[PDB]
Amino acid sequence: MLETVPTIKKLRAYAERIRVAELEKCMSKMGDDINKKTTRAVDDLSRGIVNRFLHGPMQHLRCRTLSETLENMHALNRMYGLEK
Amino acid sequence: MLETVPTIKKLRAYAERIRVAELEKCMSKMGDDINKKTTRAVDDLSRGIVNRFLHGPMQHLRCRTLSETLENMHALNRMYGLEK
Amino acid sequence: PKKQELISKLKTGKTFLRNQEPEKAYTEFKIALELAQSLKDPTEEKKAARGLGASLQRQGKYREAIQYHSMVLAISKRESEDSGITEAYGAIADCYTELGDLEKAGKFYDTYIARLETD
Amino acid sequence: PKKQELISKLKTGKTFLRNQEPEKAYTEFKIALELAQSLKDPTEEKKAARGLGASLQRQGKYREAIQYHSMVLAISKRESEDSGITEAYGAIADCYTELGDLEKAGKFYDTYIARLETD
Structure with a gap:
């Protein structure tokens, strides 16, 4: 249903803020050890962790009673402060 | 309240399975580029992302009406399949 | 080669985007897009394309x-x-x-x- | 030095733990704990301590x-x-x-x- 769509967007952005922030700190702490394959590997790590974390919640934000889907949305809103 | 305590434990283990799995794949893809500071940096990255992700939910699993806390628990249970 | 410039244009665009300058960044990624296409490098073309997308959003x-x-x-x-x-x-x-x-x-x-x- | 053995004992214990062998791993971390203490290396002592904790759980x-x-x-x-x-x-x-x-x-x-x- 359409009502949870913005929550999906907001949760993506929340996740990404964290991913980028930590990925940047990591790269800074590696100095001259950054090369293509190493850089690519750490990038894949950052989004690999984020994506596998986001899968459950976001799968459950779509398509199951509509009522539980809304509660999943509300819980996310509370837990991550998506609706400031 | 005590009822959400096991969910916290289960969510920690769920998070860690993902963190370890991805961290291991990352290290394998770096070859000989693994040295102390580089290894430490990527480890800090893996748990930095996980921890900042887990903070919201787990803070909201403790101490706010008790009713919302239980719903946060239920939503997590559904989203991450904590209660198999 | 000029692959050198492609790498530079991608990094520069990524920098302008991180510093609240999407217009300047759009300019960089646009050059990188042309470079990657002229160089026939799809992998970098996708990166250039994303940079433009991000700059536009x-x-x-x-x-x-x-x-x-x-x-x-x-x-x-x-x-x-x-x-x-x-x-x-x-x-x-x-x-x-x-x-x-x-x-x-x-x-x-x-x-x-x-x-x-x-x- | 023997710091060499400490590194080995930590890696070995971590390996036994990953392969469903907590008892064998406990033995390794226990040696590493003694090594780290005898070497006066707190940083590695904490790592050894965790390994034992994990093996026991x-x-x-x-x-x-x-x-x-x-x-x-x-x-x-x-x-x-x-x-x-x-x-x-x-x-x-x-x-x-x-x-x-x-x-x-x-x-x-x-x-x-x-x-x-x-x-």
């Missing part, structure tokens, strides 16, 4: 942003190389959401959710 | 596991070095949860939640 030009994120899909199909695909699907969905087409955004989110565990 | 010996995870806290206090602290707090809470003391587990979780954003 940042400017609020979501409809134009979709055109550039869609390239990532198009290039990937022409090349059978799926890097950036998952992010592209999600970005496009983000754009449609900002445009009010929640129906179409949901369809792209669905495609993107289905990839969240694969790598 | 894996065996279901949660009460003994707490004793070794608590060392990480103790060593950290004696040294003003806080690495492993957050994980130690959480592991101890996991142990009390497995022991049925949900009250005490909650207290340790609370301490651990409060660190989840700091680094």
